[PDB]
């Protein structure tokens, strides 16, 4: 029974060790991919603000041109 316990415990220990090794790889790859995704978001946030501003200036330019140049200046 001691022999059987020894081999079972050794098997469980190696299996847990390799799982510990693998989880670190999964953690690091998910972390760096999340970093790249946040780069993708923050880079496009500036473009979002810029195009919203461009829509705003286009809208106010159109409304200024309306009413016959706003009663002709």
């Amino acid at each position: 029974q001691e022999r059987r316990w020894k081999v079972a415990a050794a098997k469980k220990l190696v299996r847990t060790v390799v799982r510990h090794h693998e989880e670190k790889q999964l953690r690091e790859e998910r972390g760096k991919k999340e970093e790249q995704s946040r780069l993708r978001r923050i880079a496009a946030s500036t473009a979002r603000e810029i195009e919203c501003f461009w829509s705003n200036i286009e809208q106010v330019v159109e409304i200024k041109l309306r009413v016959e140049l706003e009663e002709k200046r």
């Binding site: 993708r40 923050i42 496009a44 500036t46 473009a47 979002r48 810029i50 501003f53």
Partner: protein
């Protein structure tokens, strides 16, 4: 932040540098921020020798002074040069304290992180600025055009790059660096001209040839039409006498140079062209988005003022891309100032101070936080 304070905007381009204040639709005063030194020091003793010449002082004596680019291939060569340039700009040209106004610096794409940490530490220690933000020239140039989707085909004076951007998603993996720009072809033109017997060594003559090219030479939409016109007519061909009395006759070089810009086969070497590089960059993107990227092709750059360039781009896109899909090219007259406009609009934001790296954040997170926040 306070509306009365105008953040300093300095864009050290390859061929020029632009300075101004927020709220303006164009730069006020444009002067190149390049340093021209004598070939041999000690020759001009007695006339007020100085360790460096920046601005009008170097421009006036350009004829006997060599022109050198402090940034070569987007790499810094001597940090003291830009330290001197910044000091001269703040204290003499503009007469403002950098500690009192925010300063926004621009970097080329694919910059090494070591240089980024270096300039971060430099202007945080020497100047003691309160905050720092960095933006790529190409992305600001594309955004100032007014569309967030497209590809930037900017053939700079010293280096060529292709920056595909999809609805604000910059693609650093897709950014291609190519060592084939206007510098190599201009050197080739000077080399063949020298071999032809027309000698041009002074930098003043180089700038005269550059101005003549910018004002007279135009991109050939049809090479055979140009050949027929040259063989049949001589109205477009003119002979120019330099101010120094030299007599020079300029022939087929005037329209061979724009042919060399888009067809480098004149050199006789097997290398990928700028159009091939842009095509390969577009292939790296997803297949579906190629349609809307071609539909929103935007021309911009600090060295694209060649007349007739837009028609040639239209011809090349029609030849390569299918004609069933609509193509529109928007090339505003201020495409050169597009990066300046981008810096100006970013400088006029009160909500963007959260995006700015505060002094507390910098001191807590080291210089490397600029790599996280700034793109």
């Amino acid at each position: 932040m306070d509306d009365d304070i105008a953040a300093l905007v300095v864009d050290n381009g390859s061929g020029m540098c632009k300075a101004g204040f927020a709220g303006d639709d164009a730069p006020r005063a444009v002067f190149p921020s390049i340093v021209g030194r004598p070939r041999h020091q000690g020759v001009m003793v007695g006339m007020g020798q100085k360790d460096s010449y920046v601005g009008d002082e170097a421009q006036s004596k350009r004829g006997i002074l060599t022109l050198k680019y402090p940034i070569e291939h987007g790499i810094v060569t001597n940090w003291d040069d830009m330290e001197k340039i910044w000091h001269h700009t703040f204290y003499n040209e503009l007469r403002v304290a950098p500690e009192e106004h925010p300063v926004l610096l621009t970097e080329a794409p694919l910059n090494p992180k070591a240089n980024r940490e270096k300039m971060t530490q430099i202007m945080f220690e020497t100047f003691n600025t309160p905050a720092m933000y960095v933006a790529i020239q190409a992305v600001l140039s594309l955004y100032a055009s007014g569309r967030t989707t497209g590809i930037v085909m900017d053939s700079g004076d010293g280096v060529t790059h292709t920056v595909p951007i999809y609805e604000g998603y910059a693609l650093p993996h897709a950014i291609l660096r190519l060592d084939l720009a206007g510098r190599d072809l201009t050197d080739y033109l000077m080399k063949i001209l020298t071999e032809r017997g027309y000698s041009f060594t002074t930098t003043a003559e180089r700038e005269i040839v550059r101005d003549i090219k910018e004002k007279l030479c135009y991109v050939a939409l049809d090479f055979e039409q140009e050949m027929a016109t040259a063989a049949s007519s001589s109205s477009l061909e003119k002979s120019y006498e330099l101010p120094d009395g030299q007599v020079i006759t300029i022939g087929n070089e005037r329209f061979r140079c724009p042919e060399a810009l888009f067809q480098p086969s004149f050199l006789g070497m097997e290398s990928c062209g700028i159009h091939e590089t842009t095509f390969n960059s577009i292939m790296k993107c997803d297949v579906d988005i190629r349609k809307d990227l071609y539909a929103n092709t935007v021309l911009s750059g600090g060295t694209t003022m060649y007349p007739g360039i837009a028609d040639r781009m239209q011809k090349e896109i029609t030849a390569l891309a299918p004609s069933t899909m609509k193509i529109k090219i928007i090339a505003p007259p201020e495409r050169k100032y597009s990066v300046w406009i981008g810096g100006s609009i970013l400088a006029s934001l009160s909500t963007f101070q959260q995006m700015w790296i505060s002094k507390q954040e910098y001191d807590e997170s080291g210089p490397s936080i600029v790599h996280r926040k700034c793109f």
